Design a protein around this ligand. Structure first.
Ligand code: 66X
Ligand code: CL
Ligand code: CL
Lengths: 267, 335
């Protein structure tokens, strides 16, 4: 079983990295001078997908990708997109999260090759130019990221609790695959910053049940949990699929990237 | 270049630097470990400062820091702050300072006065409490031994145990096999909770007699004939019934090749401890035997050991392992 697995309520994630929505949106206003709210969430989706691609190319397990994704989000929850190029930050996050478990120091040549290949083959609609960063930049960016997070590296995710929930239902074969993929999709939103992972797990499981037309009302009713907060999460999930439908990543994103604020150079 | 200027300079101005906040020059005591005091004399507390070896953050260092950041228990050393030096990409760790450790405390009593029995009990209890906390979070130590058992000096934590890892190399490396469980010496590939418990059993015996129970005269391989020989001289050679899965150890055939059980027919833990003036009917002895069980699945756990009637028998263990008495042990020397 995983280290610290039962320690959430005393963890740095819960105590320092569950943010208030209003504080979050307040800090966001800085970048909203350049981007609309809509373009900001489209950017979020976009960089979620970049990190997933990098993770897949490096054959990392989904938990590692999730952890990398959380690192990335925590950074731009406090700082402007101009502070550090998200194209550098994204592989930096993957690299750090890989090192958090055994089998992890992705080689230099391999990190760079992965980022180079993924942008060229999967993201040429956004990036006409080749990946311009080298490993010394990754390592510089790593120190800034570690500083921002005050070395809080252990991240909890909804996968573990989800698994326990469906096992209790006795519906692991029917519900897990869909519920799992919906959890993946929650990373396209602010959800992991705002709610404990087990609540997100329940919301995902609920949407999976609805989609598959399974009655689980009694099981849910037997839960001792603020169900109003679960409904909040369900609404964000349903909204995300409508955003997904209307958003054409490949036609829009080059233009959205050009609007992102630019780093000021030195004197 | 390529990073935002206002972002960079604002962070540099605000960033805490270890050399500005702490005095530690010429105060080395052990990477590299320093005794340190604050310059802005808000507190008069001693601190321990460690600069992690190498530059950047390795996999080993990353995961280690990641866990320490989360772990919180009175009997486990606590990470207070991390400092990141951007110029040299060095990492510093800050801890509350521990004046003593069991290595030096045991050395003191082995040199010509035995460890008081109340202290021994109290030490064991806090070690068990500490390891139970780690174990319950699925964290294993993997190198328990007296040097990694710190004890706090004068202050609001007087006489409290802190489990630690002082950065000894693990397994061409320098090390001791004295606290290493037989399954490891027979080629087990995975560390377990039971392995930590064996080492605690060894430490207990050492607190009781003042000598390492499996003492034996730089290496690469795990199998060690002489260390196994010493364990059998003390414990006796294990019968099949006592350890059935011994056959499943990768070095079992080697064991059969090099060892005959007849050699150890007169040997046992009872006889070994009697020689050292510990009575085999004492509650201490029976607890020791359970910790030093050859078959790892037959070794008791930390929680079960904590519930042993030994800790209910007079004298009860104390929070301050020194029991209010003066501390005769000397402080650390600078280097
Ligand atoms: C000299 N005086 C002094 N007073 C207090 C502390 C102290 N130091 C020096 C460095 C040591 N650092 C550690 O003990 N670090 C540490 C590292 C790892 C672990 C356990 N790991 C097991 C594997 O998983 C990662 C955690 C521990 C722990 F938890 F065992 F205490 C401490 C603490 N020195
Ligand atoms: Cl975890
Ligand atoms: Cl973002």
């Amino acid at each position: 079983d995983k280290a610290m697995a039962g320690n959430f309520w005393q963890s740095s994630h819960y105590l320092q990295w569950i943010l208030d929505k209003q504080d979050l949106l307040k800090e966001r206003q800085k970048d909203l001078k350049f981007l609309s709210e809509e373009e900001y969430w489209k950017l979020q989706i976009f960089f979620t997908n970049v990190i997933q691609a990098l993770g897949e190319h490096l054959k990392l397990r989904q938990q590692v990708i999730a952890t990398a994704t959380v690192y990335f989000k925590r950074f731009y929850a406090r700082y402007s997109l101009k502070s550090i190029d998200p194209v550098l930050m994204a592989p930096t996050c993957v690299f750090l999260a890989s090192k958090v478990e055994e089998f992890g120091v992705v080689s230099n040549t391999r990190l760079i090759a992965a980022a180079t290949s993924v942008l060229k083959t999967r993201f040429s609609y956004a990036f006409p130019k080749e990946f311009p960063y080298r490993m010394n930049h990754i390592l510089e960016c790593e120190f800034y990221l570690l500083e921002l997070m005050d070395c809080c590296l252990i991240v909890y995710h909804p996968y573990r609790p989800l698994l326990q929930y469906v096992q209790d239902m006795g519906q692991e074969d029917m519900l897990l695959p869909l519920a799992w993929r919906i959890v993946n999709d929650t990373y396209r939103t602010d959800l992991c910053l705002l709610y404990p992972p087990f609540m997100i797990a329940l919301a995902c499981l609920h949407v999976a049940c609805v989609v598959q037309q399974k009655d689980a009302r009694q099981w849910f009713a037997e839960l001792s949990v603020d169900m109003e907060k679960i409904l909040e999460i369900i609404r964000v999930i349903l909204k995300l699929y409508e955003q997904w439908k209307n958003f054409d990543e490949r036609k829009e994103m080059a233009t959205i990237l050009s609007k992102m604020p630019k780093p000021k150079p030195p004197p | 270049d390529k990073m935002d200027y206002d972002f960079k300079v604002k962070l540099s101005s605000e960033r805490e630097r270890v050399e500005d906040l702490f005095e530690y020059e010429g105060c080395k005591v052990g990477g590299h470990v320093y005794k340190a005091k604050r310059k802005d004399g808000k507190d008069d507390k001693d601190y321990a400062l460690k600069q992690i070896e190498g530059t950047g953050i390795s996999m080993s260092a990353c995961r280690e820091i990641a866990l320490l950041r989360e772990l919180k228990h009175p009997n486990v050393i606590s990470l207070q702050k991390v400092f990141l030096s951007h110029a040299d990409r060095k990492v510093w760790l800050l801890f509350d300072y521990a004046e003593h450790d069991l290595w030096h405390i045991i050395k003191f009593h082995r040199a010509s006065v035995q460890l008081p029995r109340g202290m021994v009990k109290s030490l064991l209890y806090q070690i068990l409490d500490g390891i139970h906390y780690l174990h319950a979070n699925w964290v294993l130590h993997r190198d328990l031994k007296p040097a990694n058992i710190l004890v706090m000096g004068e202050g609001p934590e007087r006489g409290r145990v802190k489990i630690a890892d002082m950065g000894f190399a693990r397994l061409p490396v320098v090390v001791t096999f004295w606290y290493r469980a037989p399954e490891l010496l027979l080629g087990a590939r995975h560390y377990t909770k039971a392995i930590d418990i064996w080492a605690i059993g060894c430490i207990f015996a050492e607190l009781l007699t003042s000598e390492p129970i499996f003492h034996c005269r730089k290496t690469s391989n795990p199998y060690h004939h002489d260390q196994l020989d010493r364990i059998f001289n003390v414990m006796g050679f294990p019968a099949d019934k006592d350890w059935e899965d011994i056959k499943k150890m990768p070095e079992h055939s080697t064991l059969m090749k090099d060892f005959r059980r007849n050699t150890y027919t007169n040997c046992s833990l009872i006889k070994y401890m009697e020689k050292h003036k510990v009575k085999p009917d004492s509650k201490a002895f029976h607890l020791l035997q359970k910790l030093l069980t050859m078959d790892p699945i037959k070794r008791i756990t930390s929680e079960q050991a904590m519930q042993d009637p030994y800790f209910l028998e007079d004298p009860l263990p104390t929070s301050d392992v020194f029991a209010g008495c003066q501390i005769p042990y000397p402080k650390r020397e600078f280097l």
